Amino acid sequence: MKVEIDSFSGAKIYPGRGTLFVRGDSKIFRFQNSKSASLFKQRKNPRRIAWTVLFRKHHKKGITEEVAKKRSRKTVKA
Amino acid sequence: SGNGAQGTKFRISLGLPVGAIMNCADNSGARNLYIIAVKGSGSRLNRLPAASLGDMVMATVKKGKPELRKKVMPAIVVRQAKSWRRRDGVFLYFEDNAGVIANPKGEMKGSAITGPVGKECADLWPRVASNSGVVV
Amino acid sequence: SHRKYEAPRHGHLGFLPRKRAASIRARVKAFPKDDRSKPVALTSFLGYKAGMTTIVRDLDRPGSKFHKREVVEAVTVVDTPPVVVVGVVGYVETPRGLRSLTTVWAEHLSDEVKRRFYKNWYKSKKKAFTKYSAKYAQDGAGIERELARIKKYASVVRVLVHTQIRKTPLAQKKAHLAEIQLNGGSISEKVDWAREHFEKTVAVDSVFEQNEMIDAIAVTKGHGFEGVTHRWGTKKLPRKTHRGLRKVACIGAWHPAHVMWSVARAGQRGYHSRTSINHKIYRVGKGDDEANGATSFDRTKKTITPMGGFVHYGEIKNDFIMVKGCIPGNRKRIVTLRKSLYTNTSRKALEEVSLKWIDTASKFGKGRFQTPAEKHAFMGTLKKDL
Amino acid sequence: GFPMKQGVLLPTRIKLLLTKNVSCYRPRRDGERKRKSVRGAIVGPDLAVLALVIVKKGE
RNA sequence: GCAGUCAAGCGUUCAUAGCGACAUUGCUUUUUGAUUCUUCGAUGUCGGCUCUUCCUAUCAUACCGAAGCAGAAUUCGGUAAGCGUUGGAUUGUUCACCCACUAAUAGGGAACGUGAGCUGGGUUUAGACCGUCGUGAGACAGGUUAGUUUUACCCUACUGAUGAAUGUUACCGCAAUAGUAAUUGAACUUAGUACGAGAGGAACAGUUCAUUCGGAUAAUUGGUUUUUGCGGCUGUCUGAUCAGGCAUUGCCGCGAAGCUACCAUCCGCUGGAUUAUGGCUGAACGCCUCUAAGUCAGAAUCCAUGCUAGAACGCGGUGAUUUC
RNA sequence: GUGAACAGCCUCUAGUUGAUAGAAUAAUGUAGAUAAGGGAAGUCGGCAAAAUAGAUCCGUAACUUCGGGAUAAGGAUUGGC
Ligand SMILES: [Mg+2]
Ligand SMILES: [Mg+2]
Ligand SMILES: [Mg+2]
Ligand SMILES: [Mg+2]
Ligand SMILES: [Mg+2]
Ligand SMILES: [Mg+2]
Ligand SMILES: [Mg+2]
Ligand SMILES: [Mg+2]
Ligand SMILES: [Mg+2]
Ligand SMILES: [Mg+2]
Ligand SMILES: [Mg+2]
Ligand SMILES: [Mg+2]
Ligand SMILES: [Mg+2]
Ligand SMILES: [Mg+2]
Ligand SMILES: [Mg+2]
Ligand SMILES: [Mg+2]
Ligand SMILES: [Mg+2]
Ligand SMILES: [Mg+2]
Ligand SMILES: [Mg+2]
Ligand SMILES: [Mg+2]
Ligand SMILES: [Mg+2]
Ligand SMILES: [Mg+2]
Ligand SMILES: [Mg+2]
Ligand SMILES: [Mg+2]
Ligand SMILES: [Mg+2]
Ligand SMILES: [Mg+2]
Ligand SMILES: [Mg+2]
Ligand SMILES: [Mg+2]
Ligand SMILES: [Mg+2]
Ligand SMILES: [Mg+2]
Ligand SMILES: [Mg+2]
Ligand SMILES: [Mg+2]
Ligand SMILES: [Mg+2]
Ligand SMILES: [Mg+2]
Ligand SMILES: [Mg+2]
Ligand SMILES: [Mg+2]
Ligand SMILES: [Mg+2]
Ligand SMILES: [Mg+2]
Ligand SMILES: [Mg+2]
Ligand SMILES: [Mg+2]
Ligand SMILES: [Mg+2]
Ligand SMILES: [Mg+2]
Ligand SMILES: [Mg+2]
Ligand SMILES: [Mg+2]
Ligand SMILES: [Mg+2]
Ligand SMILES: [Mg+2]
Ligand SMILES: [Mg+2]
Ligand SMILES: [Mg+2]
Ligand SMILES: [Mg+2]
Ligand SMILES: [Mg+2]
Ligand SMILES: [Mg+2]
Ligand SMILES: [Mg+2]
Ligand SMILES: [Mg+2]
Ligand SMILES: [Mg+2]
Ligand SMILES: [Mg+2]
Ligand SMILES: [Mg+2]
Ligand SMILES: [Mg+2]
Ligand SMILES: [Mg+2]
Ligand SMILES: [Mg+2]
Ligand SMILES: [Mg+2]
Ligand SMILES: [Mg+2]
Ligand SMILES: [Mg+2]
Ligand SMILES: [Mg+2]
Ligand SMILES: [Mg+2]
Ligand SMILES: [Mg+2]
Ligand SMILES: [Mg+2]
Ligand SMILES: [Mg+2]
Ligand SMILES: [Mg+2]
Ligand SMILES: [Mg+2]
Ligand SMILES: [Mg+2]
Ligand SMILES: [Mg+2]
Ligand SMILES: [Mg+2]
Ligand SMILES: [Mg+2]
Ligand SMILES: [Mg+2]
Ligand SMILES: [Mg+2]
Ligand SMILES: [Mg+2]
Ligand SMILES: [Mg+2]
């Protein structure tokens, strides 16, 4: 069992959910629902649709503590 | 299906009743395929026979080489726009309808299939598995 | 003349009359053949259809193109809190058929069952079974010689059980009562089991186990008055036709000069009693088990109740039977789950199913998240959090 | 047997246009670039071999 | 139109495998005639659509017997009407004829079923063109075009729906009668096996799917949108803003709930008695015979099992049973 | 006011707010809409319905009585600021 993600919105597509589209050039598209699919058919651009992962990533929405510091170094001296 | 069907196609939602026209997706000279029959179909008053992905139809060629027109030959559906459901739970659909012209055995007429192809069909006919590029 | 083209008829004549049923609780008209060599157990159970969801499991079907592959499958879920035994009835055989010889009741009966015996519970003095309860206060002579009466006679023996509807999100307040045939051994051992279980409680797993074929007995969802086209699968008449087209064009030939019992007419639709068979049990969940909805493979702590609850039902909190697919009847309705009437081999039965994953996303919309954990993980923090 | 590629996310395969001084490609010719399949950088059940590096010993 | 009896021929030989002359005996009433009993103070004329039921002279499917049955295919026959018998081009068509699928694409009845059920293409009033005929008006089982398809609220039937009265009320049941349902194909395997000189070339058991039908169901996917739920747009009106009104629901994208689709998903039981037929024992008839007595095996049949209703004038068990 | 407009649609003045009423929203209707995939296979017949549509620019066949055919066909564009 794999969870997919919506090629338009970035929602998790749990098994059985959504629909799958095979474009003529054999690119596969997966939608979580009939909403993302209709935008996709409409030639809407996910970067302009506010509620999408691609939007929020691009517009830098809420990535607050991911670009913070960390502790992942080593120590050997061999 | 019937003859040269190696395996047993699980039931896939019907998309192409008699009179549909699908793109001819091989290299044989034919552009389109007009469906006149569905092999192994059954009878119900007023029901039209309908083809699914991987069914063998009878067809005529409406657009194509003149030596390829005005006569009925077998063909095999390779792509479906009507959605359908697989047993792994997914409802999927191609962007066009298309078959390739075949002989009753199930052997193909042209050398290569010019499109993606559904596995339900790939498994079903060997000589189609050969001639395909991307499957599903 | 003659049809001039042959077609099958419409609808099945072994489901007439298509009238409303006599009751919400369809009737178990058959029980499993008795094998008295086995321990005593129930043969049916009571519960309430709550809802459906999706399942993921590998398939084990040597030969099928989907052997050793995951399939996804719909399932119903019926809320089955413990039943409670409050009586036995004993039937004897006569050349006119099976008749009931005596009931024998528990001494104390829950206000749940007591409510079933009334039509205005608030106004009533609730005198039900009050004099019967007295029959115990003796040594007990009468109840004994009644149980005793059952043993000496009585081809078959049934437990009067009833539901604990108060363990159910329903607003119904008025429990459901029913007789279940006891199929364990030795007619005398049967009433002994019965007598022991007065006011006692009996559990679903004592009647069902995983991968069992069970039948479901219930009253279909109702649809009121239906015209001939939907009620019978008739053909729509042409668009051009005067005075309506969800009709039948020829209600009958001239002779017999009578409309016939076999032709379709607009009538009631739905609310029929049905006996669906062969609904494999995919899961027997325990109420007091957080991670009901979990799996060997999933393992996240979560019950089968979807986000926001089963739509129109609530919040399943008791034990439940998960049944492959769909069941006659609709959500919140009393259903009877009955043992199979034959031992199926089928290879389709006997398949020991192992769930990989039970869907738990909301049904009230386009569910996207199994748990509020999962939800928060993906949205991050919102303007309403800490 | 296709290899992973650092920071090329999506646990799937893609066909990329690679250049000299880049992992999963050793050119044959000056100015040679070749379009080759690659497995993504996100671990998934389809992997035959995970490659790992100890950074802190255990007990 | 369908079926016989005699048996001269046909059938390499060989009357009766399969056919059958000369004759001759019949049945049928979807052929056409013959009649003129009923309807002329009107019983709506051809098809087609839709839908139900029925017949069998069986096309397919189950089980059989026969062959000029080696296998495969096919032909003849029995028990059989349980189940099915289709999609299209031309024609108003019935009929016809091709294309195509299919297990098969059987023939018939029911006021030549079926018009207050439709349709109105044909026929068959009034307009009109042609051809033939006629001095003419006009005529033509000649060709052509346009040409109003009315009413149910009654009774009964049918579908569903209440319901007085056999102390009251309540719960749980029984089961008389009635209905009843499943269907057909393929692939793998058997097996390149049995049989055959070869060319070819099966089946039972096992498995995987499918068609046609049926009963549900709505997790999923699709359709529906007055959620007038959110957003957008035009025109105008409220001084502007905010927020809104009006445009027979203004328009558009998304759209939950509900309803809903072989456009979606799930489910569709196993015992017995029989038919044909092949047999056992076994006389009549010292022999011989499946039959006379007795008897075994046996089909998509039948009766149960199951399933639906529950007799509102069929029934059982059970609870409680009023004091101004 | 929008707009080519005495069109449609909204408004000012004036005039109406008359048409039995209540409650529900079964079948079947009548008038209004939508529908996956296919696309006339429906039917006597595309009957009904759907499609098209304004304007600006490009482009425009046979044939012709030279007047036409012609918005032939076929294309692109159109808001706000
Ligand atoms: Mg939707
Ligand atoms: Mg939609
Ligand atoms: Mg098929
Ligand atoms: Mg028809
Ligand atoms: Mg090749
Ligand atoms: Mg017939
Ligand atoms: Mg007694
Ligand atoms: Mg309706
Ligand atoms: Mg249905
Ligand atoms: Mg009309
Ligand atoms: Mg009809
Ligand atoms: Mg003679
Ligand atoms: Mg001979
Ligand atoms: Mg001779
Ligand atoms: Mg005849
Ligand atoms: Mg007379
Ligand atoms: Mg007469
Ligand atoms: Mg008359
Ligand atoms: Mg008359
Ligand atoms: Mg008269
Ligand atoms: Mg009359
Ligand atoms: Mg009459
Ligand atoms: Mg011989
Ligand atoms: Mg026979
Ligand atoms: Mg019949
Ligand atoms: Mg009969
Ligand atoms: Mg036809
Ligand atoms: Mg026709
Ligand atoms: Mg001809
Ligand atoms: Mg025909
Ligand atoms: Mg007649
Ligand atoms: Mg008639
Ligand atoms: Mg009539
Ligand atoms: Mg009429
Ligand atoms: Mg006429
Ligand atoms: Mg005409
Ligand atoms: Mg005339
Ligand atoms: Mg005359
Ligand atoms: Mg005419
Ligand atoms: Mg006219
Ligand atoms: Mg009247
Ligand atoms: Mg009327
Ligand atoms: Mg082989
Ligand atoms: Mg030989
Ligand atoms: Mg059928
Ligand atoms: Mg919906
Ligand atoms: Mg709005
Ligand atoms: Mg504005
Ligand atoms: Mg402002
Ligand atoms: Mg107006
Ligand atoms: Mg069905
Ligand atoms: Mg059954
Ligand atoms: Mg019997
Ligand atoms: Mg013998
Ligand atoms: Mg016999
Ligand atoms: Mg006898
Ligand atoms: Mg005898
Ligand atoms: Mg049967
Ligand atoms: Mg049984
Ligand atoms: Mg009664
Ligand atoms: Mg009674
Ligand atoms: Mg009026
Ligand atoms: Mg009015
Ligand atoms: Mg309506
Ligand atoms: Mg729309
Ligand atoms: Mg459509
Ligand atoms: Mg088209
Ligand atoms: Mg046609
Ligand atoms: Mg066409
Ligand atoms: Mg037709
Ligand atoms: Mg015509
Ligand atoms: Mg015609
Ligand atoms: Mg047309
Ligand atoms: Mg029109
Ligand atoms: Mg449209
Ligand atoms: Mg023109
Ligand atoms: Mg501009």
CA of C95 to the centre of ligand 41 (A): 53
Distance CA C163, CA C334 (A): 9
Using CA coordinates, name the residue in chain A closest to B88.
A16
CA of C3 to the centre of ligand 39 (A): 29
Q: List CB contacts of D33: < 8 A, sequence separation 6 or more.
A: D17, D18, D19, D27
**C23 and C169 assigned to the same domain:** no
Q: How many C-beta neighbours within 10 Å does residue C245 have?
A: 14
CA of B32 to the centre of ligand 48 (A): 49
Per DSSP, helices labelled H in chain C are: 111-116, 130-137, 141-152, 187-196, 228-232, 372-379
Domain boundary among C169, C202, C235: C202
Q: Which residues in chain C have their CB less than 8 angstroms from residue A14's CB?
A: 359, 361, 370
Q: Report the CATH number at residue C67.
A: 2.40.30.10
CB B54 within 8 A of CB B121: yes
Task: Please provide residue C217's backbone torsions phi and psi, each rounded to the nearest 5 degrees.
Answer: -125, 115
Distance CA C284, CA C331 (A): 19
Judge whether C97 lies within some domain: yes
Distances (CA, A) of C264 to C1, C13, C16, C272, C276: 21, 11, 11, 17, 24
Q: Which residues in chain A have their CB less than 8 angstroms from residue B83's CB?
A: 19
Instruction: Mutation target for C interface from A1, A2, A33, A39: give the one with most C CBs within 10 A.
Output: A1
Helix (H, G, I), strand (E, B) or coil at B27: coil
- Residue whose token pair is 């034919």: B30
Judge whether C103 lies within some domain: yes
- Residue whose token pair is 């019965």: C194
Distance CA C362, CA C368 (A): 7
Q: Which residues in chain C have their CB less than 8 angstroms from residue A35's CB?
A: 366
Helix (H, G, I), strand (E, B) or coil at B34: strand
**C140 and C274 assigned to the same domain:** no
CA distance C365 to chain A (A): 10
Domain boundary among C142, C175, C202: C202
Q: Report the CATH number at residue C96.
A: 3.30.1430.10
Judge whether C23 lies within some domain: yes
CA distance B64 to chain C (A): 37
Distance CA B54, CA C65 (A): 15
As beta bridge partners, residue A5 has A12
Sign of the torsion angle spanned by Cα atoms C302, C307, C313, C314:
positive
CA C16 to C1' E149 (Å) is 38
Residues in chain A: 78
Distance CA C95, CA C68 (A): 55
CA of C240 to the centre of ligand 74 (A): 14
CA C58 to C1' E266 (Å) is 18
Per DSSP, helices labelled H in chain B are: 119-122, 126-131
Distance CA C132, CA C108 (A): 10
Task: Report, in ranges, which bases of strand F sit under 7 Å from a protein C-beta.
Answer: 26-30, 36-41, 45, 47-48
Nearest nt by C1' to B82 Cα: F37
Distances (CA, A) of C185 to C30, C37, C181, C205: 18, 5, 12, 19
Whether B and A touch, i.e. at least 3 CB pairs below 8 A, reads as yes
Chain A touched by B89 (CB under 8 Å): yes
- Contacting C residues, span 178-237, partner chain A, CB-CB under 8 Å: none
Give the range of the structural domain holding residue C299, as residue numbers without chain letter.
Answer: 16-81+203-220+270-384
Judge whether C225 lies within some domain: no
- Interface partners of C (3+ CB pairs, < 8 Å)? A, B
Domain boundary among C174, C202, C230: C202
B92, A23: Cβ pair inside 8 Å? no
Distance CA D42, CA A2 (A): 14
- Geometric angle at alpha carbon D28, from D23 and D31, rounded to 5°: 85
Q: Which residues in chain A have their CB less than 8 angstroms from residue D44's CB?
A: 2
Q: Which residues in chain C have their CB less than 8 angstroms from residue B10's CB?
A: 65-66
User: What angle, rounded to 10 degrees, do the helices at C141-152 and C130-137 form?
Assistant: 90
**C86 and C196 assigned to the same domain:** yes
Using CA coordinates, name the residue in chain A closest to D12.
A4
Give the CA-trace dihedral at C270, C271, C276, C281, to 10 degrees.
Answer: 110
Nearest nt by C1' to C227 Cα: F27
Q: How many C-beta neighbours within 10 Å does residue B32 have?
A: 17
- Geometric angle at alpha carbon C262, from C259 and C267, rounded to 5°: 80
**C90 and C195 assigned to the same domain:** yes
Judge whether C233 lies within some domain: no
Amino acid type, C171: A
The torsion region of residue D18 among left (phi > 0), alpha (psi -120 to 50) and beta comes to: beta
Task: Report, in ranges, which bases of strand E sit under 7 Å from a protein C-beta.
Answer: 48-54, 83-88, 99-105, 107-114, 116-120, 149-150, 157-162, 169-176, 179-181, 185-188, 206-223, 253-270, 305-310, 314-321
CA of C243 to the centre of ligand 62 (A): 24
Q: How many C-beta neighbours within 10 Å does residue C294 have?
A: 19
Chain C touched by B7 (CB under 8 Å): yes
Distance CA D33, CA D50 (A): 27
CA C3 to C1' E81 (Å) is 16
Sign of the torsion angle spanned by Cα atoms C52, C57, C60, C65:
positive
CB C346 within 8 A of CB C212: no
Distance CA D40, CA D17 (A): 14
**C187 and C138 assigned to the same domain:** yes
In this structure, what token pair is assigned to residue A67?
């670009």
Sign of the torsion angle spanned by Cα atoms C69, C72, C76, C80:
positive
Nearest nt by C1' to C247 Cα: F28
Judge whether C57 lies within some domain: yes
A15, C366: Cβ pair inside 8 Å? no
**C214 and C325 assigned to the same domain:** yes
* C-alpha C32, offset from chain centre: 16
CB A9 within 8 A of CB C378: no
Judge whether C56 lies within some domain: yes
Please give the tally of structural domains in chain C.
Answer: 2
Q: Which residues in chain D have their CB less than 8 angstroms from residue A72's CB?
A: 55
Nearest nt by C1' to C254 Cα: E113
Helix (H, G, I), strand (E, B) or coil at B125: coil
Nearest nt by C1' to C1 Cα: E113
Distance CA A19, CA C306 (A): 21
As beta bridge partners, residue D14 has D38
CA B21 to C1' F50 (Å) is 21
**C275 and C359 assigned to the same domain:** yes
Using CA coordinates, name the residue in chain A closest to C58.
A1
CA C51 to C1' F68 (Å) is 74
Sign of the torsion angle spanned by Cα atoms B52, B57, B62, B66:
positive
Distance CA C221, CA C269 (A): 9
The DSSP result for C42-88, as a single string, is -SEEEEEEEEEEEEEEE---TTSTTTTSEEEEEEEEEE-PPEEEEEE
Residue C57's nearest CA partner among C292, C356, C360, C358 is C356
**C88 and C151 assigned to the same domain:** yes
**C336 and C198 assigned to the same domain:** no
A14, C297: Cβ pair inside 8 Å? no
Judge whether C132 lies within some domain: yes
Q: Which residues in chain C have their CB less than 8 angstroms from residue B123's CB?
A: 65
**C149 and C134 assigned to the same domain:** yes
- Contacting C residues, span 273-302, partner chain A, CB-CB under 8 Å: 297
Pairing mode of beta strands B72-79, D13-18: unpaired
What is the set of domains in chain B, with CATH numbers? 15-136 (2.40.150.20)
**C102 and C57 assigned to the same domain:** no
Instruction: Return residues with beta carbons within 7 A of strand F.
Output: B 15-21, 48, 50, 80-83, 93, 97; C 224-230, 239-240, 242-247, 266
Tell me the technique behind this structure: X-ray
- Residue whose token pair is 């196609």: B9
